[PDB]
């Protein structure tokens, strides 16, 4: 799918060695038109038992259960989307659901309740955009963690990388061919990758883009499915 494009885009920028030029003009590479629509604002790793719960920046919630199924609660607080292993989607609500989804919906509720009361919203300083709140939300396609980061791949092709130690974050989009970098002060800049090639960037962002490439490679080498 789009991961192949993302890998192209990252290799291209990394190959240009953006931090090794005479004058870095990183600001020239910012493009506000590329600001992402969605990113993960909160997450809870309960995967030893149930799965990975997350909140998107639009206050919608989702769970990727250990059996590779998914529940998405829209930000209206009732509308539900269930995704089976093969990707089959069905629509329903918390108030009206098959009894068969009782347990999973209860789990969703607990995740929702927890991320409603606890934790800071990543990207809180970026504008809530007026849009169709029921327009199809992306869901968490897959995820994994390393010692250094959690890697989140969304069904809209975006890859998010949150670094544990310094709390910096990347939001990569292969459609916009852009990266959003959230730094240690929670400053939020969105860059077109091709312009990072043109103008370069600081060594800190350059290092993270190198890591990002490695992570996308992992996603590609383990995409599996049936």
């Amino acid at each position: 799918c789009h991961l192949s494009d993302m890998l192209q885009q990252l290799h291209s920028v990394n190959a240009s060695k953006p931090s090794e030029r005479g004058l870095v003009r990183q600001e020239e590479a910012e493009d506000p038109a590329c600001i992402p629509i969605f990113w993960v604002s909160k997450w809870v790793d309960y995967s030893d038992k149930y799965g990975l719960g997350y909140q998107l920046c639009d206050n919608s919630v989702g769970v990727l259960f250990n059996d590779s199924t998914r529940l998405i609660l829209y930000n209206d607080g009732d509308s539900l989307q269930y995704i089976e292993r093969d990707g089959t989607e069905s629509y329903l609500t918390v108030s009206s659901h098959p009894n068969s989804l009782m347990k999973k919906i209860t789990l969703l509720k607990y995740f929702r309740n927890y991320m409603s009361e606890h934790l800071l919203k990543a990207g809180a300083n970026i504008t809530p955009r007026e849009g169709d709140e029921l327009a199809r939300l992306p869901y968490l396609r897959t995820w994994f963690r390393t010692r250094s980061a959690i890697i989140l791949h969304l069904s809209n092709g975006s890859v998010q990388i949150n670094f544990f130690q310094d709390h910096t974050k990347l939001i990569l989009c292969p459609l916009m061919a852009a990266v959003t970098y959230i730094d240690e002060k929670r400053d939020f800049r969105t860059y077109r990758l091709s312009l990072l090639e043109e103008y370069g960037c600081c060594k800190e962002l350059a290092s993270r883009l190198r890591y990002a490439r490695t992570m996308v490679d992992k996603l590609l080498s383990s995409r599996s499915a049936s």
Binding site: V40, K42, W43, D45, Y46, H118, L119, L120, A122, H167
Partner: peptide, 4 residues
């Protein structure tokens, strides 16, 4: 085990 969870975000910030």
């Amino acid at each position: 085990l969870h975000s910030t």
